[PDB]
Amino acid sequence: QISEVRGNTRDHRTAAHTHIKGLGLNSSGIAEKQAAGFVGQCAAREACGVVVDLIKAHKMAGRGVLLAGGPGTGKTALALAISQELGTKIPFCPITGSEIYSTEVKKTEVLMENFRRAIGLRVRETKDVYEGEVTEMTTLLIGLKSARGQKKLRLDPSIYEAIQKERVQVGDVIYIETNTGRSDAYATEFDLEAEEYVPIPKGEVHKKKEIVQDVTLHDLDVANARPQGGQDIISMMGQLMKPKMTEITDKLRMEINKVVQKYINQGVAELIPGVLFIDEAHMLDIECFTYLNKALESPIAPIVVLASNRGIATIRGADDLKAAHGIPPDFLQRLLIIPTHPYEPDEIRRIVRIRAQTEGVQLTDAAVDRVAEHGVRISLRYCLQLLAPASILARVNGRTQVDVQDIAEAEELFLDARRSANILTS
Amino acid sequence: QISEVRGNTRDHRTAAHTHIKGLGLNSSGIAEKQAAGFVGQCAAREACGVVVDLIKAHKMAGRGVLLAGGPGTGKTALALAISQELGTKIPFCPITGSEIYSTEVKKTEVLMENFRRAIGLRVRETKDVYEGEVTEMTTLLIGLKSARGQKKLRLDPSIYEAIQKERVQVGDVIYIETNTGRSDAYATEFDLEAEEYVPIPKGEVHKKKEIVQDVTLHDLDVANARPQGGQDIISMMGQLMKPKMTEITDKLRMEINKVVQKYINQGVAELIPGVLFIDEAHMLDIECFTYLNKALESPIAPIVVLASNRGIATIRGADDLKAAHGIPPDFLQRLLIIPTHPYEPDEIRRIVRIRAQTEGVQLTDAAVDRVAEHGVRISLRYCLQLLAPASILARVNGRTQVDVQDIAEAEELFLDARRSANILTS
Amino acid sequence: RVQVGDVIYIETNTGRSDAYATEFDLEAEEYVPIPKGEVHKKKEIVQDVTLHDLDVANARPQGGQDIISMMGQLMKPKMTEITDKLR
Amino acid sequence: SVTETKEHIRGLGVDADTLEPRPSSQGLVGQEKARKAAAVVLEMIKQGKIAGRAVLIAGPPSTGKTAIAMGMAQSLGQDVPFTTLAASEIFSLEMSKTEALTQAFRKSIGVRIKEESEIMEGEVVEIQIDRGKLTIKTTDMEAIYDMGSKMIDAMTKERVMAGDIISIDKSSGKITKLGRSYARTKFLQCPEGELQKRKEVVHTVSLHEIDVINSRTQGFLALFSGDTGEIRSEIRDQINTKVAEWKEEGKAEIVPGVLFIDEVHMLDIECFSYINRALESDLAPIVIMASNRGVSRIRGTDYKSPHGLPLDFLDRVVIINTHPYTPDELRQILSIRAQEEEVDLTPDALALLTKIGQEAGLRYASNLITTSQLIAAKRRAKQVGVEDVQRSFKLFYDPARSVRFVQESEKRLIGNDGV
Amino acid sequence: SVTETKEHIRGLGVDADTLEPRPSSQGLVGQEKARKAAAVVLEMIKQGKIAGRAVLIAGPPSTGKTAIAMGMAQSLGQDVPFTTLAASEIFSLEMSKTEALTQAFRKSIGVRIKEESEIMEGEVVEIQIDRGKLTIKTTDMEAIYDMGSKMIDAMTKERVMAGDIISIDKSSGKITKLGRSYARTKFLQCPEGELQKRKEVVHTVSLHEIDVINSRTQGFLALFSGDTGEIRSEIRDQINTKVAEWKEEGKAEIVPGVLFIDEVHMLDIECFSYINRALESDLAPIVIMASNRGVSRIRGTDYKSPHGLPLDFLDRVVIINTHPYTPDELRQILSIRAQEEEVDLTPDALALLTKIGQEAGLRYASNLITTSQLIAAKRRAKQVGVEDVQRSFKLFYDPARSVRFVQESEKRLIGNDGV
Ligand SMILES: Nc1ncnc2c1ncn2[C@@H]1O[C@H](COP(=O)(O)OP(=O)(O)O)[C@@H](O)[C@H]1O
Ligand SMILES: Nc1ncnc2c1ncn2[C@@H]1O[C@H](COP(=O)(O)OP(=O)(O)O)[C@@H](O)[C@H]1O
């Protein structure tokens, strides 16, 4: 298994929230309107602040958050801001309850994968090792060689007695742990293998390198799902390669955990739980919430933030029993429910300006008004989508700056969900 | 595997249509009333004519037929007439959608079996072979012997060099392909086996025989489902022998196809697709129609004729979605829908006369009127059944010619479905 | 099994061509090279050998050299290469 | 051999610089809003922040939404994979839902490489029909070639006949019309020298075709045997690693195509999960979906939404809409599909088919073309007239008349309503 | 040993030449329409174009439809298989639906062969009862024989007692009453010579019995052990091939019997598929079905039809109908079942049972016969009187009174309706 690993995050999901850099709160925990990328919604933000403070204070004993509000609200954005306020490089794993419905994977098998995406591993270890082939062994002076470079060392008696333990003589290839083998050159064409011959450390005689890396438990999983002799096909063509994903196995995960605990024991790495955000929480069933209940208890588990835009819904896995937001009582009990409000036209115009200046598409003040009226009529979701098409229709006849005529044609070329249906119904 | 095979067709199903010898159409494609066994229904017949012409013209690109009409109409009869008009010995496989509902076989496993019943194989090869034990080998004169008979041949140099290839000398048992081995006599009691000894061809020295046979893919399947050392139990006691039919296997079918393609390649046989007729089409589910869609595409597949007497029905395999005749849109799109009309009393009296003269039971002109009034009241199906019982009741007091008194008692001894229920309800 | 264009052999007295192979095929394959570099072959086989010359010639597999006639006795104590089945 | 990713319409019919749609050149007919909307989406895709989004095409049955998807596929370029899948075909006994979806997606992802091949180039002389044999020549030689079903299809698709200078790839069977020697479009002169030359050419094959090529060739009569159509994972793993190696090396380039899923309201929650997971890979193609429903149930749950998509999905999709063709457009479409089926209509005949197309739909009107052709033939009529379109209209019913007719057995009134 | 296909009624009670039914001789009682209808069907079967059709007997509960089926079975002849199956018994844990249906059908198909056996023939002297021992003699010797449950059943079924000249097949246990030596029907004289003789006789055994015979004998207390009752296919294959060989040779002849399925509305679509497939073999027996429902749901689907048969099935079946017995017929039936259970009734008693039979049904009235017998016995009464039939009527309720009585806990009125 390997320590250094690459991480391919699903950035498609936080692409509409690239302006959200935080919650934008005062020193006294009071929300500043139009700060940190946010605009209004001060109540929900200040509430998240208490959640972020409760987490850091460890007073968040086996509890979770639930964001209740309509579509256009800042539910997903708030969750993202929470992970940001919780520190640096904190794992954020946003999902929808509809994702766990998989053909070849159990609902909780999917949840478990996402928990791993929301559990980070901060590795801040500095490794200093003097390596190479031995040349001297004499107040103890030992020499080492590299591809280009040679160092003569000055050793204490304590190390030469620990060197007496390891199979070491001149000249062999050796490794040195500062804080805590036949060289390739002597190989004859007549030897072949099995062999004891290995190359000389190229091309440095020293190695005081600093290991700085942050990765999720899932980044480790996928990194070790490929054998030596193959490429990273899982993160290249994930779902497309085959129907069932048999590469990541149970034995492989527990080997990771076995390794992860080892790095922690050596004070080398700290595992930092992040934020698991689940939209459409009413889509989860009883067996899903039973798993989440166990998750809320563990000390080394990510904060579980749920979201729902349904007031009352049937508890899935129950006989037509309806409850608040589709959440069971046994689990709703452990949630701090934070309500998200809809936006005023001036709040919507501001958000559009922020998004447009981020895209970043330039548009007139009349255009912003037209795009915001769809933020009132339809969701804030739909109207924000109108920017791209209008910008294209402009640039094509550009007139690079977007106008009202452009948003006017765009709103007719690309209808929202409700319009498209009611028009087709007729 | 064997070439010559027997075929046991389910003639129970076309027993009520023994008078239907065709569609009875003019040279101009206009229906003649009371011709080819049919009586009226000229529109549906003329429509079938276009279908039969479209098929022969290969303009029937991935399409099928759907017969929409009530029970008493000529739906099954029309389909039978289609297969007849399509040529000689054309396979006709009538079924009901309720048949595919089997305990130990998947719905499409059943459909696939029936497709094989609707795919015929016309074999018109003439094999001429001079066989027997060699006696001479000398402008090349080779002799052969049989049980009773001996022939001396006159060979060309081309065959004696092809004979140089096969292990051949005097006197061995050999085979000769005109268009394209130790003899039993020399065996000693001391040899036993393994042996190279085989009998001399009895009892002809020649064999210019003509192979003329027409069979369905299913006739081949069952023929090879029995090993040498057993009888044809499958067509003797099909369903009764055991719960699950494990004799016909996948490997066995693909071996047939492998063989069938070989006979075709040698220009020996042509496989002729027939007519697969499926009643109660609304009984099929989405997975069934997905299979039928693939069938409609294949060039070597039987014409798929469907029938239904339901105007609107729920698409099985769909969430209470109702459509025309219970057929999905993706599939209904590929169908030429032909409507069948109910019959006038004079049309019904004629049909009864035709059926009775086929049974053939003789009955009075007053009897025919009474039997036809049940053809109006109840279906044409029920009233036609009344002939047998009345004929018996006559013959028993015969008075061999059937009268009204006989149909009168028969209609009271044997009620139709609707009567029997409503009487029992009370 | 013969059609155009396949690689074929002709016996005067008594198969997919390599050119049509695609990089996407790999194996198992039916592809073989075109006869290089003559379109004919009326060759005369003239050779005299002992039964032992045949034996040793087939004692080596494809992937090895003629070690038996290079270093006969020296290679190993027992000569297991020439077997009954082979003779 | 193999098959290249060319498996009618040449584009969206849109101004290259304005994105303003010329009505019928490419040619699509009408649906100018939907076609301009498509052009914008494409421009959004070609470069920008579209970022892994599906495209939903909603509209009445027998609109041009299926054709637009191909129109979108061509705008990306030839030898760019375009695969069409009816959502219900995902449900079968031949293979699981996950398998069918994998094949469909892998049919839309093309692997492109440069390799040598035996390509033909010559002037066609003759073409035959059966229940064929191509004669092709150069200024140096003439030859007769035999071919099967798959071959004759691609040629008639590329619109080829006697006098056309064409190009045939003997390794993939890719036909290409270069021009014309005389009139009966580019006036080219007859090719010189050898009829068959070995050249370095670009080959684009789908991931699925590669999977099929490296699998045991499907037996004759495969459909009517119980044989399943799934692909062994060991074979896919073999193909995946080599394609990944070729990409690293530089031998191969991945060409994301277009996957068009029709009647997408047939998919369940699990299908939409897959489609969501697939769109999250860089190799992912453009998923384009078409629905005929206004509002439908989300299969897998007891929730209803527009077109029957999960509310999560709808927030991600780009929605294009189509509308009922105008009578003029119908008349133009049916007249085109008539000459393509080789049917000579009377001005009245086409007029009635157009009126039929209005009342019953475009597909039904289209079906009546071939039936009318045969009726005219039985008559020996010189041209397909209205007398034939009318008679086929009385013989072959459309769905609406059919259900009404079958309902006619149990009728509800003579003087007044009864029940 | 084995068991022959004799597992009460001797026929339909019909004029041999007229098919006109004498009311009660065979004896069935009443149901003259249904019995004449049966005679016609049989004549249709015996030779003609019946061609693989099932028979449906519809009518109210406790009619004679079950008895008619046996009446139909006897008309075909003795040693012709008759098996009865309640449609619900098809659903169990002991065996699958397909298995139960196979056994039921194989129980109705008899294999007939000529083989030697040890048959007994003598005049009965004594018969005993337990919680038995047959004394039989000839003019040359006398003997005592022991026997078990299965044996004592067949004899009491054939109505045998002291003075009867009988015939016992030691290989199959088939009892046959030849006649009588004296009065206490054919007056035969006592058999001479050896009591046991080896003779060539016809043996008819079902395909299922053969299957059972060639299987590991069912263990004692088989029911209350978890032991399933299915038959190994390897055993069936063995029996099928040998029966097919015997038929080819001429040793064996197949004798299609009668399969009577009661409450056939319990079968699902899959059951009807099987029954349809079975009827398509030449070996297939006569399937006779009986329903108590007017209209029922077609189990396996959401469609309702008369008797709960698939609309396809109903078009193939021949429907016979039965009706409520007349009071005279009930009185005659109950009086017959009284002497068969050995109960001496009073003219009033029978009258009340008949009135009870009208109100609650024939089966219920029948149940009250034995309960009344025991009440009269506890009384030491010489004959079963009305005082006993009345007391048993107050003690043991029928279904209607029972449900009303249990509903009585939650009642709906005293002055008026309440709810
Ligand atoms: N208060 C806010 N300030 C700035 N942007 C906001 C605010 N609320 C929502 N948005 C933006 O509007 C869009 C709404 O999306 P989101 O917050 O995910 O909604 P949901 O409630 O459905 O989770 C996103 O682009 C988000 O960044
Ligand atoms: N036009 C017709 N001329 C002659 N016999 C007909 C005609 N129409 C129906 N019949 C006969 O009447 C009966 C009706 O059966 P069938 O055609 O199979 O009905 P269905 O519509 O249920 O398929 C059959 O015996 C059939 O041969």
Author numbering:
A (entry chain A), B (entry chain A): 3 to 140, 157 to 198, 205 to 450
C (entry chain A): 185 to 198, 205 to 277
D (entry chain B), E (entry chain B): 8 to 14, 26 to 149, 158 to 210, 221 to 455
Question: What does the publication say?
Answer:
Rvb1 and Rvb2 are highly conserved eukaryotic proteins, very similar to each other, that belong to the large AAA+ (ATPases associated with diverse cellular activities) superfamily of ATPases. Domain II (DII) corresponds to an insertion of 160–170 amino acids in domain DI between the Walker A and B motifs that is unique to Rvb1 and Rvb2 in comparison with other AAA+ family members. Here, we report the crystal structure of the dodecameric Rvb1/Rvb2 complex from Chaetomium thermophilum (Ct) at 2.9 and 3 Å resolution in two nucleotide binding states (ADP/ADP and ADP/PP) together with two cryo-EM reconstructions of the same complex in the stretched and compact conformation at 21 and 12 Å resolution.
The Rvb1/Rvb2 complex crystallized in space group H32 with one Rvb1/Rvb2 heterodimer in the asymmetric unit. The SeMet crystals revealed density in Rvb1 that could be identified as ADP, whereas Rvb2 clearly shows two density peaks at the same position most likely corresponding to sulphates present in the crystallization solution and known to mimic phosphates. Second, Asp298 in the Walker B motif flips towards the sulphate in the PP state. Finally, the “trans-arginine finger” Arg358 of Rvb1 that protrudes into the Rvb2 nucleotide binding pocket stabilizes both the ADP and the PP state. Despite some missing residues in the sulphate-bound Rvb2, this tail has a similar position as in the ADP-bound Rvb1.
